[PDB]
Symmetry: none
Subunit: 92 residues, 2 copies
């Protein structure tokens, strides 16, 4: 009902605006929360998607090392080298 | 004898016996080494600049606020954007701003 000023923590833009009648600061903050909750779920979803992509890339990298190797030790060394190449790109 | 891949094995040519003395679990370990290396590379070079969630919501809320004149229509519009975001999510797509 009654409009009360925003508190110190209010993150809203135009927080003090009373341009929309009967719309409280806290009602706007509740809407902000609904949006935050949705975006948080969206982020979790895209992270799950990124992991699946990362897994697919790893499978591909491992398979190419497997297919190019004939003996177990050289396979391993080839894997360690590719890991080294990834760490390098990580700096650059 | 050769130990078969289990039902969760992520490898291509998982059951291939071509490399002697190379177990499926050894290949999976190597896959995990590569995966961790990639995950770090990816999380560093390309994911450390994701926007703050509250900052995103502030702009979405304000965009709704400034385009509305009446409280109930402001609220319906907020719920519409919430629904839009959910839809992006079920499709595993990011809501970037």
């Amino acid at each position: 009902e009654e409009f009360v000023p925003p508190d110190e923590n209010c993150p809203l833009k135009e927080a003090s605006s009373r341009r929309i009648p009967r719309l409280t600061v806290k009602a706007r903050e509740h809407c902000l929360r609904l949006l935050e909750e949705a975006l948080s779920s969206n982020r979790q979803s895209t992270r799950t998607a990124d992991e699946a992509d990362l897994r697919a890339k790893a499978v591909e990298l491992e398979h190419e090392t497997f297919r190019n190797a004939k003996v177990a030790n050289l396979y391993k060394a080839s894997v360690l080298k590719k890991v080294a190449d990834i760490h390098r790109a990580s700096k650059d």
